[PDB]
CSV table of C-alpha atoms and ligand atoms in Angstrom, one decimal:
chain,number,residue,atom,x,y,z
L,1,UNK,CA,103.4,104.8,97.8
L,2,UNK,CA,105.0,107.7,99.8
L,3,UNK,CA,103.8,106.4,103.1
L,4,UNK,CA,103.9,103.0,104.9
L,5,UNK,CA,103.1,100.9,108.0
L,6,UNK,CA,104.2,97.9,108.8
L,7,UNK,CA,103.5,96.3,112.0
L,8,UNK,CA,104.7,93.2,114.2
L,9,UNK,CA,103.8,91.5,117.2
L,10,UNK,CA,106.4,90.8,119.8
L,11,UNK,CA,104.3,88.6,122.2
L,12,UNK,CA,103.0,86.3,119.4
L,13,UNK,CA,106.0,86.5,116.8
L,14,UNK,CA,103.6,87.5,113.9
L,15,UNK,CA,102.5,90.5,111.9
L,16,UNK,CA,100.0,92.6,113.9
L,17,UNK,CA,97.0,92.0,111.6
L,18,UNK,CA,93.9,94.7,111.8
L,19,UNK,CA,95.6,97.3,113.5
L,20,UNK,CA,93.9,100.6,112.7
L,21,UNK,CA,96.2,103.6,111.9
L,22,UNK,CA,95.8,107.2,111.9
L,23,UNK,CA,97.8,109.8,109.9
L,24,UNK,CA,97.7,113.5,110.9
L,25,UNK,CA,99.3,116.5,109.6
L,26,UNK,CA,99.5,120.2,111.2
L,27,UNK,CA,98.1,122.5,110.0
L,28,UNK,CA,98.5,126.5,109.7
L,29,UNK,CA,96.8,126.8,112.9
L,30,UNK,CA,99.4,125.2,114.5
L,31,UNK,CA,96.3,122.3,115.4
L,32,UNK,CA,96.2,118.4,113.9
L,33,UNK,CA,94.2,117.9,111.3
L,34,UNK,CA,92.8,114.8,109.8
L,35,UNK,CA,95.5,113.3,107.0
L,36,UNK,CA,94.6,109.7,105.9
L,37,UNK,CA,93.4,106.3,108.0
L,38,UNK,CA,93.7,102.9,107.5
L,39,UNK,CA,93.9,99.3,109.0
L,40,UNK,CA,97.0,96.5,108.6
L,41,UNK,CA,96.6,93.8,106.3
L,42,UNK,CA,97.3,90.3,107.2
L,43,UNK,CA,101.4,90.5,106.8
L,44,UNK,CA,100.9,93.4,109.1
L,45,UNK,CA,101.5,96.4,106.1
L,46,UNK,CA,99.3,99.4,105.4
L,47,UNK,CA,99.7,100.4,102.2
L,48,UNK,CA,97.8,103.2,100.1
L,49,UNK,CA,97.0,105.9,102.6
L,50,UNK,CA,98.3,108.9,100.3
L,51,UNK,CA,99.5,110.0,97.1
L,52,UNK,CA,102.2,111.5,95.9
L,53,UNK,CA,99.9,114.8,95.5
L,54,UNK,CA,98.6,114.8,98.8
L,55,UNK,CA,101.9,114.1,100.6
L,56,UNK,CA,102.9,117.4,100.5
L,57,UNK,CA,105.5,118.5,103.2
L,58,UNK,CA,104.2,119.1,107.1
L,59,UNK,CA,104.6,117.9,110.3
L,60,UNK,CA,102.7,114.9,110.1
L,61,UNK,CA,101.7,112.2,113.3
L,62,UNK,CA,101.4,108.7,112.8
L,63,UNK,CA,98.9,107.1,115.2
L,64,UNK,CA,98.7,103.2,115.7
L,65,UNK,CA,96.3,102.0,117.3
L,66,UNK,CA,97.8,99.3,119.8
L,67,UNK,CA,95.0,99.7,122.7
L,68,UNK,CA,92.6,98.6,121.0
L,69,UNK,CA,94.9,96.0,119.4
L,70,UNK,CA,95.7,94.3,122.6
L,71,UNK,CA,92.3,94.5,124.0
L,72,UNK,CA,90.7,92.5,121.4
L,73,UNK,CA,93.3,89.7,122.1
L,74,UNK,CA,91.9,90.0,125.0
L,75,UNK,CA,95.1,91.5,126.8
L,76,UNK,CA,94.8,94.9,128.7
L,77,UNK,CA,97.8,97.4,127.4
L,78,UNK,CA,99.6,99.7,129.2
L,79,UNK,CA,99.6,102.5,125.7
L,80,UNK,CA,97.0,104.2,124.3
L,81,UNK,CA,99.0,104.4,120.8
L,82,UNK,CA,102.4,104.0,118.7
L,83,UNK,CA,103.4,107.0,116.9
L,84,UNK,CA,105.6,108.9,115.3
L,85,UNK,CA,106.0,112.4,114.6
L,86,UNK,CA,107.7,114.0,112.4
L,87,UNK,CA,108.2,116.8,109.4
L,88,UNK,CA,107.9,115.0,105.8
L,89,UNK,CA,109.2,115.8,102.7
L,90,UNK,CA,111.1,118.9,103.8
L,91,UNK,CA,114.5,118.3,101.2
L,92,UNK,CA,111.9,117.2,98.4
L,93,UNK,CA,109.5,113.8,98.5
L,94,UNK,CA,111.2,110.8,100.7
L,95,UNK,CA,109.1,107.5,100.8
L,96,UNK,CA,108.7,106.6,104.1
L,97,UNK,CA,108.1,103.4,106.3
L,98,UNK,CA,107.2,103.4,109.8
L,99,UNK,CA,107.9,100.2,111.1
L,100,UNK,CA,106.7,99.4,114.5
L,101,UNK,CA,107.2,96.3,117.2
L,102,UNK,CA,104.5,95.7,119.7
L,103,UNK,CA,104.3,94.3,123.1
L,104,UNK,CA,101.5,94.8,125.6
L,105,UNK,CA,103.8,97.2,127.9
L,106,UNK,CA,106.2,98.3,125.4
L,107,UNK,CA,106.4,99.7,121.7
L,108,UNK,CA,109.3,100.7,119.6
L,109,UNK,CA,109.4,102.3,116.1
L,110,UNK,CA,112.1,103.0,113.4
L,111,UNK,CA,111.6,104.9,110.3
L,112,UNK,CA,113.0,103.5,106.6
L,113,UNK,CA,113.2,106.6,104.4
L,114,UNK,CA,114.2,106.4,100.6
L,115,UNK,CA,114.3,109.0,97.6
P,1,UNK,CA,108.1,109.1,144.0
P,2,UNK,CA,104.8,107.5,141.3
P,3,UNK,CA,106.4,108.8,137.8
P,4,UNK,CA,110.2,108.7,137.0
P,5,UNK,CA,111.7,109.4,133.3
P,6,UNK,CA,115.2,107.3,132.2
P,7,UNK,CA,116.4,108.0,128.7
P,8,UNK,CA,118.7,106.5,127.2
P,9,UNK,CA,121.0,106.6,123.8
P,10,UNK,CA,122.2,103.7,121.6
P,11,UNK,CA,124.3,105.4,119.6
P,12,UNK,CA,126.5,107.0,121.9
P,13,UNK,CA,125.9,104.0,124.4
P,14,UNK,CA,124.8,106.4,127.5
P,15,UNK,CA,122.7,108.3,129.6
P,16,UNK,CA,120.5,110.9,127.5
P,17,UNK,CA,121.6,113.7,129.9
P,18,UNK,CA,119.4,117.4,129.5
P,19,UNK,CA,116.9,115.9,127.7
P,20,UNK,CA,113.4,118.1,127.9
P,21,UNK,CA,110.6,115.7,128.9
P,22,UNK,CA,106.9,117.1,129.2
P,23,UNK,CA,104.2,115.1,131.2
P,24,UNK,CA,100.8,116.4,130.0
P,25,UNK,CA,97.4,114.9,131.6
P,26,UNK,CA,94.3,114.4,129.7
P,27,UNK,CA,91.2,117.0,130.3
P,28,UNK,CA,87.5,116.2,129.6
P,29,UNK,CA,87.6,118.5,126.2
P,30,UNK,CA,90.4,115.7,125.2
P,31,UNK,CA,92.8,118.4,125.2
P,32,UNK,CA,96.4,117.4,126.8
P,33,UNK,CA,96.7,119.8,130.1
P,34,UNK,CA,100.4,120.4,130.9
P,35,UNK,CA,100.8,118.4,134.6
P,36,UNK,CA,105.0,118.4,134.9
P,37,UNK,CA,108.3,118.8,132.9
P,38,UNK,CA,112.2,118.8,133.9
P,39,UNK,CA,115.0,117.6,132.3
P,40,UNK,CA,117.4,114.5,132.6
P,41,UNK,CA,120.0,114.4,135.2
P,42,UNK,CA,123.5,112.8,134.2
P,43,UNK,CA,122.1,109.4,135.2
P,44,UNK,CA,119.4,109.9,132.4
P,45,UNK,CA,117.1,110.0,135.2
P,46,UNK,CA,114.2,112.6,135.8
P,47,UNK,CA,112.7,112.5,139.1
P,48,UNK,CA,110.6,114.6,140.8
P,49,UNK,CA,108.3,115.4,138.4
P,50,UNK,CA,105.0,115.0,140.7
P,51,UNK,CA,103.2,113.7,144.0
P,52,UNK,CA,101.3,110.5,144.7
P,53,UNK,CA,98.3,113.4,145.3
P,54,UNK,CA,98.8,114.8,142.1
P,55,UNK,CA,99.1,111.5,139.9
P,56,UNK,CA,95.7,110.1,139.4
P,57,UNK,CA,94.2,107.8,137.4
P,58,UNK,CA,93.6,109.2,133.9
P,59,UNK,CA,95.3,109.4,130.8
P,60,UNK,CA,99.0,110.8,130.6
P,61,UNK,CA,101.4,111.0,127.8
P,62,UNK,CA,104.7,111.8,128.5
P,63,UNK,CA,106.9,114.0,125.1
P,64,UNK,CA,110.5,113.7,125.3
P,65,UNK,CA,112.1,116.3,123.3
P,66,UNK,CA,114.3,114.0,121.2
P,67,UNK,CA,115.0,116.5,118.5
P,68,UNK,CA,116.6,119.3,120.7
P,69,UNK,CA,119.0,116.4,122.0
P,70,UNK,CA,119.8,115.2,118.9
P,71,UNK,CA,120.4,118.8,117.4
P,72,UNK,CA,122.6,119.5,120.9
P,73,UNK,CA,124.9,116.5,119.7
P,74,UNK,CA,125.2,117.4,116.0
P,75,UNK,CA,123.2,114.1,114.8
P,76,UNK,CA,120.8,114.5,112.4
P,77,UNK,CA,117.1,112.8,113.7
P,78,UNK,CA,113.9,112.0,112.1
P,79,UNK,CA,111.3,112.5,114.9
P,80,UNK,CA,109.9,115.6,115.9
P,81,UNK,CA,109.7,114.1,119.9
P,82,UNK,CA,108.6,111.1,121.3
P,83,UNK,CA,105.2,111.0,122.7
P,84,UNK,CA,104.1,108.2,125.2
P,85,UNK,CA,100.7,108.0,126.1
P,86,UNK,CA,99.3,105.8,128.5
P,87,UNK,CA,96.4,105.0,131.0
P,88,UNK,CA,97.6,105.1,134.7
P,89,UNK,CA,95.0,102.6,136.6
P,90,UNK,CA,97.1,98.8,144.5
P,91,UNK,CA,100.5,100.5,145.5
P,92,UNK,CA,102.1,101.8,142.3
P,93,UNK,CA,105.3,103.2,140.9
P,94,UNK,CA,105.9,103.9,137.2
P,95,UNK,CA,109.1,104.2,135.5
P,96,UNK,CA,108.6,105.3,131.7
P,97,UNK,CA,111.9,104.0,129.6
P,98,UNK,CA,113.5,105.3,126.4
P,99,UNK,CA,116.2,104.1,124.4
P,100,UNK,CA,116.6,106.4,121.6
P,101,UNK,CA,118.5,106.4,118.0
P,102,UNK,CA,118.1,109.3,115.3
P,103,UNK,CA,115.6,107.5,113.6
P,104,UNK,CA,113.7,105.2,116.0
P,105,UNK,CA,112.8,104.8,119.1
P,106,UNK,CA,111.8,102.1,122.0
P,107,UNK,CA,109.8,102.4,125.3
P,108,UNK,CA,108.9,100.6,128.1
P,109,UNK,CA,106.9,101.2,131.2
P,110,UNK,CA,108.3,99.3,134.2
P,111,UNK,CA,105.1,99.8,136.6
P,112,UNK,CA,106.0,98.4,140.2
P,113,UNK,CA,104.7,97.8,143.9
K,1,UNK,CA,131.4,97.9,139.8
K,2,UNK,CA,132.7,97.6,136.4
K,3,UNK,CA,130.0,94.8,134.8
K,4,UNK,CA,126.3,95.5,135.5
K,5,UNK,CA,123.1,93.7,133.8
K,6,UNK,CA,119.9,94.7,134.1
K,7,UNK,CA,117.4,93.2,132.2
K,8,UNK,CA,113.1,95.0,132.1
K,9,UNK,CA,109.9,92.2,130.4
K,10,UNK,CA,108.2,94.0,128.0
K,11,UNK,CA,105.1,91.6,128.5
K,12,UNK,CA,104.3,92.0,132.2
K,13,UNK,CA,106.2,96.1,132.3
K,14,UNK,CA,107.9,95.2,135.2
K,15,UNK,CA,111.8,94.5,136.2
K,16,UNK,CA,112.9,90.7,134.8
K,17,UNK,CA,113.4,88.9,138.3
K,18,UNK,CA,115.3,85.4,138.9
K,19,UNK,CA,117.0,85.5,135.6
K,20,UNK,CA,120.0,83.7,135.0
K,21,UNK,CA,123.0,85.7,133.0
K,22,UNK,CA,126.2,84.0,132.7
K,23,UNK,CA,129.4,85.6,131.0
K,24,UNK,CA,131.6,84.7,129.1
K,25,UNK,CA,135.4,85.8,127.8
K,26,UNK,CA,136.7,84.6,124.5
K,27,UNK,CA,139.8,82.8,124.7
K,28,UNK,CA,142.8,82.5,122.6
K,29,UNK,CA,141.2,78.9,120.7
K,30,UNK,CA,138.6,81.4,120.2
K,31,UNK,CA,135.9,79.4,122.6
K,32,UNK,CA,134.1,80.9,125.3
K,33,UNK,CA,135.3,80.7,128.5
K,34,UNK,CA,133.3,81.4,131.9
K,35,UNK,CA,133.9,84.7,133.7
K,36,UNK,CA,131.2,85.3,136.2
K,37,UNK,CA,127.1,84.8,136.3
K,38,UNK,CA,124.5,84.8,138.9
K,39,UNK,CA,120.6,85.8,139.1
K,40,UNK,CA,118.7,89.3,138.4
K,41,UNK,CA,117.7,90.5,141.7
K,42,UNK,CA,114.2,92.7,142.7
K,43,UNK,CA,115.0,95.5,139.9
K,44,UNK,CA,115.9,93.4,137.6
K,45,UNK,CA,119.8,94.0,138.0
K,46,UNK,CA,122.9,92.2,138.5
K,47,UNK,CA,125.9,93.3,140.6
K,48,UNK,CA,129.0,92.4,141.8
K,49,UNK,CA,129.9,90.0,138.5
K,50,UNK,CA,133.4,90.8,138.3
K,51,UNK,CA,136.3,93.4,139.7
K,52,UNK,CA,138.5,95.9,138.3
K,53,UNK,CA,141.2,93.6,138.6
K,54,UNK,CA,139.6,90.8,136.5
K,55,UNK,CA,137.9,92.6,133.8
K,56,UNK,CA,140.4,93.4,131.5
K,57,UNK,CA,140.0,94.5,127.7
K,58,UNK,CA,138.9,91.6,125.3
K,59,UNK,CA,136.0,90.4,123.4
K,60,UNK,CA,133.0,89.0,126.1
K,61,UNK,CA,129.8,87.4,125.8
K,62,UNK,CA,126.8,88.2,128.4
K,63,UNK,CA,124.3,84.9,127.6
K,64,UNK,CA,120.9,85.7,129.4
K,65,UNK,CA,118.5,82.7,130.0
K,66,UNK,CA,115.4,84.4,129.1
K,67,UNK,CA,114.1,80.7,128.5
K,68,UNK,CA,114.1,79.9,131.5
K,69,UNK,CA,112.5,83.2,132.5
K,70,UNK,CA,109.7,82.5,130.5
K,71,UNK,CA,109.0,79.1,131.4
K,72,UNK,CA,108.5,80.2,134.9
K,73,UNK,CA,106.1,82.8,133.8
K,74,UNK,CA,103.9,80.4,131.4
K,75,UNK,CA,104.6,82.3,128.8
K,76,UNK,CA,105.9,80.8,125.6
K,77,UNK,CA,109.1,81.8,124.2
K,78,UNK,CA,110.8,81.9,120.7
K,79,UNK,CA,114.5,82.6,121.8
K,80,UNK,CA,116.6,80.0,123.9
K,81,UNK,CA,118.9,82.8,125.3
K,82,UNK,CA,120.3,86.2,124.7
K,83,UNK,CA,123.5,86.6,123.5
K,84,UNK,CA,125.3,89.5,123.8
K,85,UNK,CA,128.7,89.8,122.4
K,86,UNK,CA,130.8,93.2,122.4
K,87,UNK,CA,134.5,94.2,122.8
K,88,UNK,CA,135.7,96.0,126.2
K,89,UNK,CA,138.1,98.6,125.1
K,90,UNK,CA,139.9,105.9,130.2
K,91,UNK,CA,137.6,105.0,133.5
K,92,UNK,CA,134.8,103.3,132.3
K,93,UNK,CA,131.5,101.0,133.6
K,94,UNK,CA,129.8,99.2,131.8
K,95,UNK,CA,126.2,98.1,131.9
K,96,UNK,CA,124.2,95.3,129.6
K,97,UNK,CA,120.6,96.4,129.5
K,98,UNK,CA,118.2,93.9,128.1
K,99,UNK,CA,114.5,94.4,127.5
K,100,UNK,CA,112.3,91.1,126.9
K,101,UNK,CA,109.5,90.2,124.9
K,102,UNK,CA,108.8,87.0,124.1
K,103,UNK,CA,109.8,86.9,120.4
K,104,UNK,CA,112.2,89.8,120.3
K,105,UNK,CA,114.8,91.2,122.3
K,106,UNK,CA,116.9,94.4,122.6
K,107,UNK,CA,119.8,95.1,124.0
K,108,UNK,CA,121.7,98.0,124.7
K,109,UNK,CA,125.0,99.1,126.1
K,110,UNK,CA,125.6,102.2,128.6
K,111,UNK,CA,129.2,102.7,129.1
K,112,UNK,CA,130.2,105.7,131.5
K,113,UNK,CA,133.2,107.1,132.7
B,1,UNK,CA,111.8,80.0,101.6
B,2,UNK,CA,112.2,79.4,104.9
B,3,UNK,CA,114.2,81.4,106.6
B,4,UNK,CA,114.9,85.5,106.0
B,5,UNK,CA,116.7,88.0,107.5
B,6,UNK,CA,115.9,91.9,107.2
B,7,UNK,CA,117.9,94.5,108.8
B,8,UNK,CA,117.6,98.1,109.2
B,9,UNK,CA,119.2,101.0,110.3
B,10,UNK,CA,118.3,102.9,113.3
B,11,UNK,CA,120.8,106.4,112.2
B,12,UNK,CA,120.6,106.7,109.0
B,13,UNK,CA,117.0,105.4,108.8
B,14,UNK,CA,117.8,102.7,106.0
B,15,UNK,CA,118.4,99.3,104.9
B,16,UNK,CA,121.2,97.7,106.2
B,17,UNK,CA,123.3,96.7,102.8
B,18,UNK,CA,125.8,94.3,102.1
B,19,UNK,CA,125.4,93.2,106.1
B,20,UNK,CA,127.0,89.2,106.5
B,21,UNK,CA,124.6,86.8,107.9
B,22,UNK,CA,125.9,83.1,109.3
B,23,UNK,CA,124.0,80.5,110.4
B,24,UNK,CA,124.7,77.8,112.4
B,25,UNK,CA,123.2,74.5,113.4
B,26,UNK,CA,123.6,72.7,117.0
B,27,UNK,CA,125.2,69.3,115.8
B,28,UNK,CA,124.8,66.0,117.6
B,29,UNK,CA,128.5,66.7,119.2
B,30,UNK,CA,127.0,70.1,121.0
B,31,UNK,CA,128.6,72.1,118.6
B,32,UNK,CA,127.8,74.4,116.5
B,33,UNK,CA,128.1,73.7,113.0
B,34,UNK,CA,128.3,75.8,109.7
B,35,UNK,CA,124.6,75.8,108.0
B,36,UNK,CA,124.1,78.8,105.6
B,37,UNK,CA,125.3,82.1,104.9
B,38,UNK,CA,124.6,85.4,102.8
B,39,UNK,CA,124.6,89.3,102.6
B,40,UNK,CA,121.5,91.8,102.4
B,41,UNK,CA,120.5,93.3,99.4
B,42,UNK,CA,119.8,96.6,98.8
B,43,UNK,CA,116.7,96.7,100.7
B,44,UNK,CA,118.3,94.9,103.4
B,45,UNK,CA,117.0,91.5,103.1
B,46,UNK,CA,119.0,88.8,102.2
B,47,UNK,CA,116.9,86.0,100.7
B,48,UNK,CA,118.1,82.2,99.4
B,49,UNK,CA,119.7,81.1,103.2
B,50,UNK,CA,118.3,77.5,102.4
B,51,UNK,CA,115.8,75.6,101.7
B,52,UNK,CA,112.9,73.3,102.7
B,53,UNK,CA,114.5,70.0,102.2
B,54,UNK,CA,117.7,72.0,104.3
B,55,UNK,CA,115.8,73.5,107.3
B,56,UNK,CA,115.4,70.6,109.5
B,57,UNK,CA,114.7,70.6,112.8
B,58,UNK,CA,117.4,71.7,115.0
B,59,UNK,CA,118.8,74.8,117.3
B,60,UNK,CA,120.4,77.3,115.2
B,61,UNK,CA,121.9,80.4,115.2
B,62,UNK,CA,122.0,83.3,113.2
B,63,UNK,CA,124.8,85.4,113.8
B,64,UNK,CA,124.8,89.2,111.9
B,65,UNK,CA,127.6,90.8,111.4
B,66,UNK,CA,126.6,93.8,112.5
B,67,UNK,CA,130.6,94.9,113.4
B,68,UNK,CA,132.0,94.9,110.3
B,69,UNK,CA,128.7,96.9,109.1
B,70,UNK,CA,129.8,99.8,111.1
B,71,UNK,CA,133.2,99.7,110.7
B,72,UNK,CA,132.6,100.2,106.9
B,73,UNK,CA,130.4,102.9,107.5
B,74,UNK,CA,133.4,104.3,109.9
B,75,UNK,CA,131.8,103.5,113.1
B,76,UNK,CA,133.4,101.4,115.8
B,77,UNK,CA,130.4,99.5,117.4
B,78,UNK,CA,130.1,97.9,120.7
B,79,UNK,CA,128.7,94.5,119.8
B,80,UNK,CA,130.1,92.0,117.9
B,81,UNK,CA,127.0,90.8,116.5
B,82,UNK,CA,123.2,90.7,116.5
B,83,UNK,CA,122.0,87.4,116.9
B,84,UNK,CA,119.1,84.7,117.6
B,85,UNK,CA,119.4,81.2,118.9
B,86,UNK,CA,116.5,79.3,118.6
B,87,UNK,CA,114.5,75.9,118.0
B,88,UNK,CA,113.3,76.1,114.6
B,89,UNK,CA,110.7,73.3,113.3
B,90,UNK,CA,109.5,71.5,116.1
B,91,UNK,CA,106.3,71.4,115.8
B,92,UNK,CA,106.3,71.0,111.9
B,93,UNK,CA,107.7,73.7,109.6
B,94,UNK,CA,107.9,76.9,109.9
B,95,UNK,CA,108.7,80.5,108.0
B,96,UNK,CA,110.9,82.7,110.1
B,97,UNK,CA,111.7,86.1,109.5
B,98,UNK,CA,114.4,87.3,111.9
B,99,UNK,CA,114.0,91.2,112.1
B,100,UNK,CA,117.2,92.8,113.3
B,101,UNK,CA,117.3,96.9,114.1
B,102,UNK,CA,121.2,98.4,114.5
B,103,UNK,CA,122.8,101.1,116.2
B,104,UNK,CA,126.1,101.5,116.9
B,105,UNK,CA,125.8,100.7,120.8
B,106,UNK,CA,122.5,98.2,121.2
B,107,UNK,CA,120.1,96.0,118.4
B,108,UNK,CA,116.8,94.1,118.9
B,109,UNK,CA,115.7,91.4,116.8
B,110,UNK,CA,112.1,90.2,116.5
B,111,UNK,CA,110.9,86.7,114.9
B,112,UNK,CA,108.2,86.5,112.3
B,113,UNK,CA,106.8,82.8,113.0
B,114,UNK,CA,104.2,81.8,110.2
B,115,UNK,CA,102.6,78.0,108.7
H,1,LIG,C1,113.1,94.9,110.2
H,1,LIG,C2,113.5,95.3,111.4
H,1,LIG,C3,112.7,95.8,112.4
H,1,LIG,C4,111.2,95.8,112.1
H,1,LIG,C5,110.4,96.4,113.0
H,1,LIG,C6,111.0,96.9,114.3
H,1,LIG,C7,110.6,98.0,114.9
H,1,LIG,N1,111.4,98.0,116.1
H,1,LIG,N2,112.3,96.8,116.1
H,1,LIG,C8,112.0,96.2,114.9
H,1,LIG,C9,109.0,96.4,112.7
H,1,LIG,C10,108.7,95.9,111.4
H,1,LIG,N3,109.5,95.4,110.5
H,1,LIG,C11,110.8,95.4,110.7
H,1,LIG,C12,111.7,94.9,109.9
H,2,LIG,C1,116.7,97.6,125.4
H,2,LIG,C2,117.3,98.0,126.6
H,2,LIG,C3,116.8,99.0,127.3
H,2,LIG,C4,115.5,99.6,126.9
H,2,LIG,C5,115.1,100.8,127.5
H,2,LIG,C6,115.7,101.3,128.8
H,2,LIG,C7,116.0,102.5,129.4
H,2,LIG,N1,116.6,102.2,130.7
H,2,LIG,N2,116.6,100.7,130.9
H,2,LIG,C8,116.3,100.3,129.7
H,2,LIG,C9,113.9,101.4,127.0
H,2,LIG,C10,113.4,100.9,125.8
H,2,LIG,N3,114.0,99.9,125.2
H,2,LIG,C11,115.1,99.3,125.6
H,2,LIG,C12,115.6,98.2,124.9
H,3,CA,CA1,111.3,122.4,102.5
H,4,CA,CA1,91.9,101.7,139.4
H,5,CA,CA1,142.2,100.3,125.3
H,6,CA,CA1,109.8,67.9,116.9
């Protein structure tokens, strides 16, 4: 599992549980195209959203989707998103988690990569 | 003035001075329309960067070229930038915060009266 | 001055107001012994803690009542304080940023010359 | 297991390994009394702290040792330590995760709070 996504929830001091997330990569065209998608468990991880194949280097952008997280607490957030970008892969294949802490007017994110 | 940029570093435990920071305002083909840019001041500060008749509502995001500091220092970072995008909605000032490390980083928005 | 905190909620995005910071200088019995404190102003900052003359090089904790804070909001709160503990070692200033949430915290240190 | 503590690192984009951990409790007296201690692991958790029958009610703190972390790595650090202080239990029993993200001059903890 090259890629991960964990997510926690500063207000409520719990994983951030049905949080969609959206993975891009660049393409040749210099444009963003459509990578892999998915949603956060119930201990706030997303797991499975590549392979080992697919994972190939790139410039890739990590999406979370906090807005919509917030709003269906029924809290309005200042961010449209968490993210990350950045290039994968480039000294061979890393596994990497992006870890992200939410608050409604706030976000930070750290990256855990291993060989 | 509405919009002001602070950046700072936690590893060298200051002001991110020269930083490049982009402010880019969303169009209706949801393409990101480039609406002001500068760079940090020795305070970490960027002001300046627009007008209270320029900044309307809509949706901004705000790319802080992380890696080009990073790179100017000799530390080795893991993002490409940071990119904070956010809906701007009475009397208003915002103040968009970064604390950044080579392989994370934190925001805030500090949005005043 | 040489001792600044300034301390940002992460909940509301706007400057943490009324807070009460205390510090602290570790003594030779190695207990805590009180330096200076008072309350976050407007911005969120506190001034005029200490002198030149008084703060000398040692070890010093910064103990932020974000409890309270919270409280007062109606928010609920996992944290009964901050702590922040860190050596003072040319010209320097320091300042203690905090940034608030209930559940977490982070702190950083901007020391300038 | 009630109480864990990760830690990561926000250069190097790792575990924080071999990192000491203390905990105390708030005794009767107002003082703070020795409760547990530990090191990470390799993937910077450190696991074991105590147990059910242990983790009573109380105010306790968890002090990392976040100094001597850098200083091994040949940093010299501003703080002293990351830390919470906190009332653990009081409405029942609790899990807690105390998340803890280093660099040399600032950290931010989180709590995971689950039943
Ligand atoms: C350990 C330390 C940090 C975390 C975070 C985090 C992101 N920013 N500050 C903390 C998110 C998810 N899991 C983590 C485990
Ligand atoms: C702790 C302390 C400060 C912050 C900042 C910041 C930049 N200027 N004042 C604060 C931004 C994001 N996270 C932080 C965490
Ligand atoms: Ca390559
Ligand atoms: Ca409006
Ligand atoms: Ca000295
Ligand atoms: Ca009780």
């Amino acid at each position: 599992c090259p890629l991960m996504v964990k997510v926690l929830d500063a207000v409520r001091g719990s994983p951030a549980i049905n949080v969609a997330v959206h993975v891009f990569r660049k393409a040749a065209d210099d444009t963003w195209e459509p990578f892999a998608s998915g949603k956060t468990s119930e201990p706030g991880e997303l797991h499975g959203l590549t392979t080992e194949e697919e994972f190939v280097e790139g410039i890739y952008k990590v999406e979370i989707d906090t807005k919509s997280y917030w709003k269906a607490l029924g809290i309005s957030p200042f961010h449209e998103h968490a993210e990350v970008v950045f290039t994968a892969n480039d000294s061979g294949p890393r596994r990497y988690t992006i870890a992200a802490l939410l608050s409604p007017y706030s976000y930070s994110t750290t990256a855990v990569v291993t060989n």
